[PDB]
Amino acid sequence: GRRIQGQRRGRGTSTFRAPSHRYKADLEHRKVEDGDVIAGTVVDIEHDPARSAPVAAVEFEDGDRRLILAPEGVGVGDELQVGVSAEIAPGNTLPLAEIPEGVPVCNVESSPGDGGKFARASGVNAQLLTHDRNVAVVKLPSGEMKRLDPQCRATIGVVAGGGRTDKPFVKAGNKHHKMKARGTKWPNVRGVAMNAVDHPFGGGGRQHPGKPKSISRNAPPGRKVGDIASKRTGRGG
Amino acid sequence: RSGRFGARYGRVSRRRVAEIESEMNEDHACPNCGEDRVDRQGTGIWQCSYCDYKFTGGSYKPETPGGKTVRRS
Amino acid sequence: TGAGTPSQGKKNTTTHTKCRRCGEKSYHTKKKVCSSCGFGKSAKRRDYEWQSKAGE
RNA sequence: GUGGAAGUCUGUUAGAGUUGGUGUCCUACAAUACCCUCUCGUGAUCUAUGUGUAGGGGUGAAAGGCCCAUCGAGUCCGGCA
RNA sequence: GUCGGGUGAGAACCCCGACGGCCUAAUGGAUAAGGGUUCCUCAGCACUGCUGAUCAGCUGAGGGUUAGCCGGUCCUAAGUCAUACCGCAACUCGACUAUGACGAAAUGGGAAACGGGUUAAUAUUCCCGUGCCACUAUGCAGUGAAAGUUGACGCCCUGGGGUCGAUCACGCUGGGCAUCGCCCAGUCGAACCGUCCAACUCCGUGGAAGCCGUAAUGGCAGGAAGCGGACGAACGGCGGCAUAGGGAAACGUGAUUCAACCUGGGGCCCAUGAAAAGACGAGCAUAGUGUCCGUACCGAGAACCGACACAGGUGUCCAUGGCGGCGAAAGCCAAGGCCUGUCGGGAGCAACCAACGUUAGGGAAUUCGGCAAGUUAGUCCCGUACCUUCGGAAGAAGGGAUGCCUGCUCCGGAACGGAGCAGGUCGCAGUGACUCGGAAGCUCGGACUGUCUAGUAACAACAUAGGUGACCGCAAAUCCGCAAGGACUCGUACGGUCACUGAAUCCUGCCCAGUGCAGGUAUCUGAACACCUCGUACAAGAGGACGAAGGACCUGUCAACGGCGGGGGUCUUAAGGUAGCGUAGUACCUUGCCGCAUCAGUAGCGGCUUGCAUGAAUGGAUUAACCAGAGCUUCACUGUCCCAACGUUGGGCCCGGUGAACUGUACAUUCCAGUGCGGAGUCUGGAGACACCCAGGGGGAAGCGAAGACCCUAUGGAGCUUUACUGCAGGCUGUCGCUGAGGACUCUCACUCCGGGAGGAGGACACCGAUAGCCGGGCA
RNA sequence: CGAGUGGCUUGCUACCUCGAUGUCGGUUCCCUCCAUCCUGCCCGUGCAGAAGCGGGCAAGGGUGAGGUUGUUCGCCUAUUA
RNA sequence: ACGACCGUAUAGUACGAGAGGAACUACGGUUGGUGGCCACUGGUGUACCGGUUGUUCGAGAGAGCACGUGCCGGGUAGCCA
Ligand SMILES: [Cl-]
Ligand SMILES: [Cl-]
Ligand SMILES: [Cl-]
Ligand SMILES: [K+]
Ligand SMILES: [Mg+2]
Ligand SMILES: [Mg+2]
Ligand SMILES: [Mg+2]
Ligand SMILES: [Mg+2]
Ligand SMILES: [Mg+2]
Ligand SMILES: [Mg+2]
Ligand SMILES: [Mg+2]
Ligand SMILES: [Mg+2]
Ligand SMILES: [Mg+2]
Ligand SMILES: [Mg+2]
Ligand SMILES: [Mg+2]
Ligand SMILES: [Mg+2]
Ligand SMILES: [Mg+2]
Ligand SMILES: [Mg+2]
Ligand SMILES: [Mg+2]
Ligand SMILES: [Mg+2]
Ligand SMILES: [Mg+2]
Ligand SMILES: [Mg+2]
Ligand SMILES: [Mg+2]
Ligand SMILES: [Mg+2]
Ligand SMILES: [Mg+2]
Ligand SMILES: [Mg+2]
Ligand SMILES: [Mg+2]
Ligand SMILES: [Mg+2]
Ligand SMILES: [Mg+2]
Ligand SMILES: [Mg+2]
Ligand SMILES: [Mg+2]
Ligand SMILES: [Mg+2]
Ligand SMILES: [Mg+2]
Ligand SMILES: [Mg+2]
Ligand SMILES: [Mg+2]
Ligand SMILES: [Mg+2]
Ligand SMILES: [Mg+2]
Ligand SMILES: [Mg+2]
Ligand SMILES: [Mg+2]
Ligand SMILES: [Mg+2]
Ligand SMILES: [Mg+2]
Ligand SMILES: [Mg+2]
Ligand SMILES: [Mg+2]
Ligand SMILES: [Mg+2]
Ligand SMILES: [Mg+2]
Ligand SMILES: [Mg+2]
Ligand SMILES: [Mg+2]
Ligand SMILES: [Mg+2]
Ligand SMILES: [Mg+2]
Ligand SMILES: [Mg+2]
Ligand SMILES: [Mg+2]
Ligand SMILES: [Mg+2]
Ligand code: NA
Ligand code: NA
Ligand code: NA
Ligand code: NA
Ligand code: NA
Ligand code: NA
Ligand code: NA
Ligand code: NA
Ligand code: NA
Ligand code: NA
Ligand code: NA
Ligand code: NA
Ligand code: NA
Ligand code: NA
Ligand code: NA
Ligand code: NA
Ligand code: NA
Ligand code: NA
Ligand code: NA
Ligand code: NA
Ligand code: NA
C-alpha cells in the first residue's frame, strides 16, 4: 500500500510547506537588559498574512523598529511600554507577577525569554487568576489552568480581530484563498472516497470505513487516522 | 449585503453575511475623539477618515464584547 | 490531448548539453551534472560494473 | 435617481474545455486527426518562463489518475543463459 | 487559376504582363524558445520535392552577421551548488548552521541614441548629421553627504490631462472618372535642449452656524466658498534642433472621439498583493577612456517538437486601417502577403459514396430515444403564471413594431451621438444577406460555480460552503529521517492536526450485548534483571518471592464499527424501526391495484402500500436556483418515416505522370447431395463449365487482423484484504548502562531545555545504547 | 393406456473450433418447408337461410399498420379475405 | 405477372313462422404486385428572369463576393411519382 496523505506532509515538500518567503515577521516580545525604560509609539496598523489578525508597527527610543502583536484598542499615535515597572495599560508587555489579578492578557510566555507562546490568535485571551512568589496560574483560552513562572512576560488585553470566526466563508472560492496563504494541503478528499491502496478507509463497494473509526494511541503512522484515542464520540449522553 | 449571492448558498449563509456586514458598514464612534467616521480598512484594521486615527478592534466590529471588558479591569 | 503526437509540440526546452569534461551531450544544464561522466557530481568519472556483463 | 456588487447572465473577443453526431478518418494528414454540434468564458480562471517533489517513491477537488506514445508500481543496464 | 509572352534541348506548375482569385488577430508586421548557415551570389539536377521543373529550404563552390548609449554583463526571486560543521561502515550520500557563489536575453529591477543614407546579403552596430550617459584626468566651484526620496509593486469601479490613429470642415499638390461632381493619395520632419502645469500636498488671506463639491463618495468653526502663494506631470504643448532630413508637388489650418503615456477619487480581503543592486539627495569647463560576448536567417499548413516539406502541437507584441454593428462578431474591402493548405488531362460527368440544396399531401407513424435535420432569432413597445431561500422564476408565455424618401422635434457643448414626430412611398418579405432562444409541463439526482478517467465513462462520482466528532498548552498533537536533523511554524486553541456528513429549511428515535477507543480496577493472570533455596568446588539446569504494560473484571462512549427480529397477550443477541419516506436508481412476486393520459401506454405521474430485503451525519425528509446528468407529456417544427425524386460540390470512370501495403502449403471454372475428427472448391456420386477482361455490391473461402479477454488447467505472476502462517518497523512497559549526593522522600554535579549574558527551569528523571513482555496488514 | 414422427424449445453428452467460426433483439434482402390463418376446389353436420362448427385436397399468391417493452415472447387498438 | 377485396343487378328474391337472407351469371371500382410512359397534376430544375439586404468598383449605368445560388419570387427542357 502507498503512503497515506498524512505521511507526505512529514517530508515537508513544497505542496505542504508554509509560504514563509511571503510572510512578514516573527512577533516576539522585546528583550530589555532591565530598568523597564523601554517605551515606543504606535506608527501603523497592518494585516499579518500568517495569522489573519492585525498587527501594530512600533518605534522605540533607541531607534528600534519592530512589528508587534496588536491587542484590541491600540491606535496610531499611542504609547506602549515594555518592562518590570510598566504601566497596567492595554498592550503594555510585562511579567505576570507585576500584573494584578483578574486582568485579560495575551501573548503569554511559556518560559521567560522565549517571547510569547500562548493566546495569540483572533480575539482570544488568557486570564490571570492567582499569584505567588513561586507560581502564577493562568487560564488559557482552551480553559486549561496553566501553572506559570511569574517571571514570564505577557501582554495586557485581548488579541484584536475578534469575531472573525463568526461569519461563514460562504463559498469555496474564499476558503481556497485563505488556504493558499498557509502551509496546508487543500481541498480534502475523504479517506473513504479513496481506493483500498490509498488509505485504510479506502475501497469497498460503497463508501464506508470497514474498520471502526476510533483508534489506539499506540498505532503506527500509516494507520493512525480517524477518531484518535477518542475518549468518546458523538454528543448523545 | 448578500444580494450579490443570488439564490445560491441558502438563508443561514447570506443572512449571517448581511448582518455581520450590516454592522461593519455602520457609523462607528471613534475612541480618539468622538466623530462617527471609522470605517473598515482591512481585516481588523480600523481607521477614522476624520482624524486619520488608525486603530485595532474586532474583525467586523470596531469593538468586541470581550474588548470592552479589558477597560474595566 | 494525447501524450503522443500532440504533446510532442511543446518540447523545446534545453536539458542535456555538451559536457565539458567527457565531451558528451549529457550535461543537464538545469542540474549542471552529466548523465554520462558524472562531472559536476563526482570528482571521479562515473562508472558502473553493470555497463557490461558480470564475468566481464 | 445615483452606485456598479457578482466563484452572475449572454457570448466561436481572446483563451480554456470536449456533449452528441456513435459523422468523416480507421495500412490516416494524425500511434488519439477533421468537420458541425456543445461547455466555461473576473476567477477554486487561463498562460509563458523559471523553479521544487523520484520509483513501493512523488503527485493526485480520488479516475488506481499522472510521473516523456511506458504505470494495480516509470525507464535503462545488470543479476540473466 | 486563364491568355499572352520570356529563358531553355526540354516548360501545366521557373520568370514578366493582363484578366481572375485567396488571406484580415491572419496566409500581414515584429519576435522568445528551438533549429544552425537553412540567409546572399554563381554554377548545377545523380539525390530531396506527393506529377514536372530550366525552380528550390536540394547538390557544389564562394560571400555574409561590424554597437559606450539593442541585448547579455550587473542586481536580487522561488530556489541551486560549493567550502566549513555534523551524520554515515562509507561515498559521487544526508537534514541544520555559517560563509561564498549561482539563479531573469520575449516577460522582474536597469546610467545613456534619435533622423536619414547605404548592401546581393548587416545595420538605433557601417556612413552623413545631431545628441546623450559613465568612469578617470585636469581646472574652478563645493565643503556640503546622510537623513530622506526613488528602485518598489493587489483586484474592481471611475474622473481629468493627452499624443498617434480615424472622421469631419476648408485650402494647396498629384492622380482617377466621364451625362453627373464625385472618388483616392499626399499635405512629413526625431532624439535632445529649453520652456509651460494640470491633479495631489501644503501656506497666507477669508470667516460660511448651512454653505462648498462630485460621475460617485463626500468637505467644514479642529475653519467651508472666494482670493493669493509655495511645491508639483506626460512618450503632452510651445521655441530651438532644422535655408538637418525627406518629398514628383504642396510642404495645411481648425475640430471631435481620443490607444500610448500622465495624474486623481472611490470600493474589496477569514486573500494585504517581491527583493536587491542601483538612482536621486549632491555644480560646471575641457580632454581621456568605454574592453568581452550575441548580431545571418526561420519563427512555421516546408527552417521549431511530432520518424515526413505531418490537416497535430508550440509564448509574447501589433485589438485604432474602411463600410457594418453593441462588438476585437458576421459579412464585404484596403495595406501587406499569396495562387506552395502544391500533380495533372477528358466524360451533362453512369452505378456507388462523401459534404449539401429543395421537395407535394401527411407531420414523430421513424426510433431504445425526435438520433439527424429543422423550428425560434437581433432591437422597441404592451405584457407575464406556479413556485420562491424574496435573490429568482423571467428574455416566463402571449401580443404589436422594424424599410426606403421629405421636412422636423427633444436630450447634449458637440459627435461623422442618442430618443422621437408628421407626411410621402415600393416588395411576397424591411433584424430583407449576415448576425440571430424553439416554448411549456410532471418526476428522479446532486444544493449551487467548480473537479475527473491525456487516449471509449463528464455523471448521480470528487470538491464545496455548511454540520458533527476526535487529538493536543506548544519540550504539544500529527507527520519525515538510519542518523545528524526536518515539515507543520515568521504558527499558539477565534489554532492545526485527524476523521466522517455535504448549502439553506424541519428534524436526526431506541441499542454499549459483541467489536473499537478511552478510564478504573480488591483480587486473578503477567517477561526479563536483581533478591532467595536447590544444584554444580564454577556453569548448565530445578524451584521460590516480587511483578510493569497488557488481559480478566467494572464504567464510559454510536454525528464509533455497526444493530433495530422470530414467537405470545417473552427467546436469540444489547434494543426491537420513532419523524419521514415507500412498487423507490431500494419491491423477488411485477406489467402489484385504482386513476390521469392514449384508439391502444411492461413507459411516465398521483394515490394506495403488509417495505422479498426503506429510515434518520452508514444521515431522513423537504426544497427555490443551477445542469452537454436520467425517464415522460403538449404546442410549435421538419424528408425521422409514408416513399422516394431531382439537384450541387469532391471522388468515383477513361488518359499522362508517380507508385506502396495487407496477404500467399499447393492445386483451384464450380454447383447439388453425400461422406469425413460430427461445418469440404480439392474425398464419393452426379450436374454444370470455351478462354480473357472491365465495373459492381460483398454470399462463401468457418475471408484478413490479434499464439481467446470468456472457461479450466499450472504444486504461474502481480495488486489488494483480514480475527490466514511467519515476521518487521512503530507505541506502550519492566529492567541494564549513561548515573552523582543524604516503598516513600530531599538535593546538585552529570545530562536536558530557555536565556545575549548573569542566570532561569528540569534533575539522576528525560534523552540515547541493550534487553524483556504486550500490541502491532503501517510494511514484508 | 398404448404406438410413433419432427428436431422450433428445454435438458443430457463433451465428438468439433480456445495461434478467436464476432452476442441477443432489430433491421434489410434472398431461396425454402407444410404440420394451411386467408384465398381455390371438396366432405360431414347437432347442414332451413345467413352465419358457423369438424374434417380432406392444396405451398400459386397473401399474411399489413400501430401503443408499453432492448426484448424474443407476449399484453393492447384500430383496420383486415 | 398477376393475387384479393367492395360495390351494382340477380333480390328484399330462394329458404324461413318471423327475424333474417343467399347463389349461378353480367357489370363497375379499389387494393397489393408488375411492366412502361411524361399530354395532364406535383417535385426538381445553384439553365433562365425578376425583388431585395450588406459591401466593393466615386455616383449612375453595369457588375463581383456573401459555400460552392446571399436571401426571396417565378420557373423551360429533362429526370421523376
Ligand atoms: Cl480554516
Ligand atoms: Cl538581443
Ligand atoms: Cl474625480
Ligand atoms: K472457440
Ligand atoms: Mg514564531
Ligand atoms: Mg468550522
Ligand atoms: Mg500551502
Ligand atoms: Mg471532502
Ligand atoms: Mg473510487
Ligand atoms: Mg490498507
Ligand atoms: Mg456515502
Ligand atoms: Mg459513510
Ligand atoms: Mg461567470
Ligand atoms: Mg456508426
Ligand atoms: Mg512550470
Ligand atoms: Mg476501481
Ligand atoms: Mg523515453
Ligand atoms: Mg504516459
Ligand atoms: Mg557553406
Ligand atoms: Mg534562398
Ligand atoms: Mg539558380
Ligand atoms: Mg548572477
Ligand atoms: Mg528586463
Ligand atoms: Mg534581412
Ligand atoms: Mg535580423
Ligand atoms: Mg507543403
Ligand atoms: Mg414534405
Ligand atoms: Mg412509436
Ligand atoms: Mg439533434
Ligand atoms: Mg441642444
Ligand atoms: Mg433569419
Ligand atoms: Mg452537480
Ligand atoms: Mg477519457
Ligand atoms: Mg460534464
Ligand atoms: Mg467523453
Ligand atoms: Mg461528493
Ligand atoms: Mg466544513
Ligand atoms: Mg468543519
Ligand atoms: Mg407507480
Ligand atoms: Mg441516530
Ligand atoms: Mg467432384
Ligand atoms: Mg492461447
Ligand atoms: Mg476469470
Ligand atoms: Mg501470488
Ligand atoms: Mg535550543
Ligand atoms: Mg501482505
Ligand atoms: Mg471436446
Ligand atoms: Mg466468417
Ligand atoms: Mg397436407
Ligand atoms: Mg349456410
Ligand atoms: Mg413457394
Ligand atoms: Mg456565388
Ligand atoms: Na472502505
Ligand atoms: Na438605490
Ligand atoms: Na467537438
Ligand atoms: Na518500480
Ligand atoms: Na535480465
Ligand atoms: Na517638454
Ligand atoms: Na469601425
Ligand atoms: Na504544382
Ligand atoms: Na462558472
Ligand atoms: Na458545472
Ligand atoms: Na456494544
Ligand atoms: Na462497548
Ligand atoms: Na438500517
Ligand atoms: Na432532404
Ligand atoms: Na465474397
Ligand atoms: Na496487480
Ligand atoms: Na439442444
Ligand atoms: Na481455428
Ligand atoms: Na441481430
Ligand atoms: Na399456398
Ligand atoms: Na408491440
UniProtKB/Swiss-Prot annotation, chain A:
Keyword Glycosyltransferase: no
GO cellular component: cytosolic large ribosomal subunit
A GO term, aspect molecular function: rRNA binding
Region (Disordered): 199-237
GO biological process: cytoplasmic translation
Lineage top rank: taxon: Archaea
Impact noted for substituting residue 199 to A/G: No incorporation into translating E.coli polysomes; ribosomes assemble normally. Significantly reduced translational activity
Pfam families reported for this sequence: Ribosomal_L2, Ribosomal_L2_C
Record's subunit section: Part of the 50S ribosomal subunit. Forms a bridge to the 30S subunit in the 70S ribosome. Interacts weakly with protein L37Ae.
Family named by the database record: Belongs to the universal ribosomal protein uL2 family.
Job description of the protein: One of the primary rRNA binding proteins. Required for association of the 30S and 50S subunits to form the 70S ribosome, for tRNA binding and peptide bond formation. It has been suggested to have peptidyltransferase activity; this is somewhat controversial. Makes several contacts with the 16S rRNA in the 70S ribosome.
HAMAP family hit by this protein: Ribosomal_uL2_A
Additional information: This protein can be partially incorporated into E.coli polysomes in vivo, indicating it can replace the endogenous protein.
Designated name of the protein: Large ribosomal subunit protein uL2
Organismal lineage: Archaea, Methanobacteriati, Methanobacteriota, Stenosarchaea group, Halobacteria
Curated annotation (Swiss-Prot), chain B:
Keywords: Metal-binding, Ribonucleoprotein, Ribosomal protein, RNA-binding, rRNA-binding, Zinc, Zinc-finger
Record's subunit section: Part of the 50S ribosomal subunit. Contacts protein L2.
Disulfide bonds: none
GO biological process: translation
Ligand binding (Zn(2+)): 30, 33, 48, 51
Organism: Haloarcula marismortui (strain ATCC 43049 / DSM 3752 / JCM 8966 / VKM B-1809)
Job description of the protein: Binds to the 23S rRNA.
Note accompanying the cofactor annotation: Binds 1 zinc ion per subunit.
Family recorded in the similarity comment: Belongs to the eukaryotic ribosomal protein eL43 family. Putative zinc-binding subfamily.
An example Gene Ontology CC term for this record: ribosome
Annotated GO MF terms: large ribosomal subunit rRNA binding; structural constituent of ribosome; zinc ion binding
Protein name according to UniProt: Large ribosomal subunit protein eL43
Cofactor requirement: Zn(2+)
Zinc fingers classed as C4-type: ranges: 30-51
Gene giving rise to this polypeptide: rpl37ae
Curated annotation (Swiss-Prot), chain C:
Keywords: Metal-binding, Ribonucleoprotein, Ribosomal protein, RNA-binding, rRNA-binding, Zinc, Zinc-finger
MF annotations from Gene Ontology: rRNA binding; structural constituent of ribosome; zinc ion binding
Zinc finger map (C4-type): 19-37
One term under GO cellular component: cytosolic large ribosomal subunit
Biased composition (Polar residues): 1-16
Region (Disordered) residue spans: 1-25
GO annotation (BP), single: translation
Pfam family membership, one: Ribosomal_L37e
SUPFAM superfamilies: Zn-binding ribosomal proteins
Positions annotated to bind Zn(2+): 19, 22, 34, 37
The protein's required cofactors: Zn(2+)
Bound cofactor: record note: Binds 1 zinc ion per subunit.
InterPro entries xref list: Ribosomal_eL37, Ribosomal_eL37/eL43, Ribosomal_eL37_CS, Ribosomal_zn-bd
Function text: Binds to the 23S rRNA.
UniProt similarity note: Belongs to the eukaryotic ribosomal protein eL37 family.
Quaternary structure and partners: Part of the 50S ribosomal subunit. Interacts weakly with protein L4.
Name of protein: Large ribosomal subunit protein eL37
The species this protein was found in: Haloarcula marismortui (strain ATCC 43049 / DSM 3752 / JCM 8966 / VKM B-1809) (Halobacterium marismortui)
Lineage summary: Archaea, Methanobacteriati, Methanobacteriota, Stenosarchaea group, Halobacteria
